[PDB]
Design an enzyme around this catalytic site. Structure first.
Site, PDB file in Angstrom:
ATOM      1  N   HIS B  41      34.867  41.679  24.480  1.00 26.21           N
ATOM      2  CA  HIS B  41      33.495  41.476  24.930  1.00 26.21           C
ATOM      3  C   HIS B  41      33.081  42.474  26.014  1.00 26.21           C
ATOM      4  CE1 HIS B  41      35.281  38.759  28.145  1.00 26.21           C
ATOM      5  NE2 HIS B  41      34.343  39.369  28.848  1.00 26.21           N
ATOM      6  N   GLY B 143      34.158  39.969  37.177  1.00 25.24           N
ATOM      7  CA  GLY B 143      34.822  41.245  37.016  1.00 25.24           C
ATOM      8  C   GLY B 143      36.324  41.148  36.843  1.00 25.24           C
ATOM      9  N   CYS B 145      37.850  39.709  34.174  1.00 24.91           N
ATOM     10  CA  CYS B 145      38.234  39.757  32.770  1.00 24.91           C
ATOM     11  C   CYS B 145      39.136  40.956  32.507  1.00 24.91           C
ATOM     12  CB  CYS B 145      36.978  39.811  31.893  1.00 24.91           C
ATOM     13  SG  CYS B 145      35.925  38.373  32.190  1.00 24.91           S
TER      14      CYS B 145
END
Lengths: 303, 303
Positions: B41, B143, B145
């Protein structure tokens, strides 16, 4: 979201850990520039530790009696000296992995990361608070002496702790990197008293703020209090007295949550007088005091 | 002595973290050999995440649309592909810091270290358990991920987790390094149910053994029980059922302490039925289940 006890990344410190041997005693050293720092009791036998005269013992050691191993390569010891309770071994080679660093003496209630090491090899990393009685509650198994505590600020490593002793009560004691013990302790195998282990009030407060920010709000109450009236309660429960400096450092947490510091104090007061009733706060069933306000803010981007 | 929740030293993993940007979405990637792994993503807008068609979205990305930053130097993207929910970015340069590594899918109840990262920079390290419902209770701010979970075995790094999602309930979900989610979760911003979050019984047992070894013995009782009779109690309290494999893996802890596994089960049963009465075990006021038997043994040299 979420809130976890969290240590700094240990990579900058891993590259500085070495193994120091003198006679048949092996422990960990810290290799920065061309100097290796380690507990001076590397020079002691088990019998020596009952009552050592460190000056007399060191008299009988020369440079070549100190075996220093970084991984598998030799460091050549070209000088040694005793600074308080640490030995400084001058070696022929600057550590190429030396980071930007400073030596800091931290205050009670401040926190730091410990890189537990064994025979010069890093084993694990965890967060510690310096208790108000100048012990830490660590995990230090045999051979972990010389492991260090540190904080990191971008790229600068502030070393604040070197592990030396386990007291007969199972808590841990140690020095700053100039070899001065935190607390009244000595590097001798004798009975040594830590005083009362009081709770770091300002840290509990910061952690309650963290809980609110993370959506744990049940303990928020309808009361407020005064500094002296809270401290009256704090003293009964062996909590550190709260001061206007502590109130000041909680300001940004108070501002984000809209909860005045003294309202949070009143909620804490009710928690101490009434307990937690089998509930949890941030997954804990007691009041946590090993998060500083700075620790909390590092994990609450809204502050 | 002492017992602490402890993560592996993160240095081998720090040297692999990079920053991956596609459009205006930035997150963390893992740089091993000449491939960068990151959540797919990264290619989504905020609107895309409500209901993304990842194939269609990726169709419109070329190699040059992926900006990969290791520190300050460029990695040139010479190829990209989607493996389940991860993107694999082939780059022109093998990471010189690549350690020995494997990709592992871990079992529920197993533990691992998380290196929380932000914009490609490591921020902290902490230990996590994969819950039986395949969530973790982490600290993942915006942030984070692409941050990874790992275990280390001497010098080999076993990557087992990559962070992808926070569910509306505040727990965290993610994939192995082949991009297959742990649990039934999907990388879409929709309501997703974790089932009942049951307790990892075998881990609580191991931690009670650790407590005994460390001198916390008050909860030791005069009863024993049977596997089925314990599980009858376990089920009422949403504890994972105990199996003979679990009994087997506790063997070395049973041998060191002389406490048969079923006697410890009976002590646990009494703790669940009677509570802890405001006492603590290893400094905790509830039963800890994020230490595996292997975790305990790593900190109990007598085992």
């Amino acid at each position: 979201s979420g809130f976890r006890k969290m240590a700094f990344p240990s990579g900058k410190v891993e590259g500085c850990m070495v193994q120091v041997t003198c006679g048949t005693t092996t422990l960990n050293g810290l290799w920065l520039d061309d100097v290796v720092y380690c507990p001076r009791h590397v020079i002691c036998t088990s019998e020596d530790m009952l009552n050592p005269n460190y000056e007399d013992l060191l008299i009988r050691k020369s440079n070549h009696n100190f075996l220093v191993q970084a991984g598998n390569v030799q460091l050549r010891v070209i000088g040694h000296s005793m600074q308080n309770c640490v030995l400084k071994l001058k070696v022929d080679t600057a550590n190429p992995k030396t980071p930007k660093y400073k030596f800091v003496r931290i205050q009670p209630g401040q926190t730091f990361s410990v890189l537990a090491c064994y025979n010069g090899s890093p084993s694990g990393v965890y967060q510690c608070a310096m208790r108000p009685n100048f012990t830490i509650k660590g995990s230090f198994l045999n051979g972990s002496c010389g492991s260090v505590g540190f904080n990191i600020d971008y790229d600068c490593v502030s070393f604040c702790y070197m592990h030396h002793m386990e007291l007969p009560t199972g808590v841990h004691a140690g020095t700053d990197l100039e070899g001065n013990f935190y607390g009244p302790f000595v590097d001798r195998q004798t009975a040594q008293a830590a005083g009362t282990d009081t709770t770091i009030t300002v840290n509990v407060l910061a952690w309650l703020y963290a809980a609110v920010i993370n959506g744990d709000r049940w303990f928020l109450n309808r009361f407020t209090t005064t500094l002296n009236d809270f401290n009256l309660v704090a003293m009964k429960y062996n909590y550190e007295p709260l001061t206007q400096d502590h109130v000041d450092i909680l300001g940004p947490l108070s501002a984000q949550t809209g909860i005045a510091v003294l309202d949070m104090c009143a909620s804490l007061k009710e928690l101490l007088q009434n307990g937690m009733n089998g509930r949890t706060i941030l997954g804990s069933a007691l009041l946590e005091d090993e998060f500083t306000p700075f620790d909390v803010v590092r994990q609450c981007p809204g502050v």
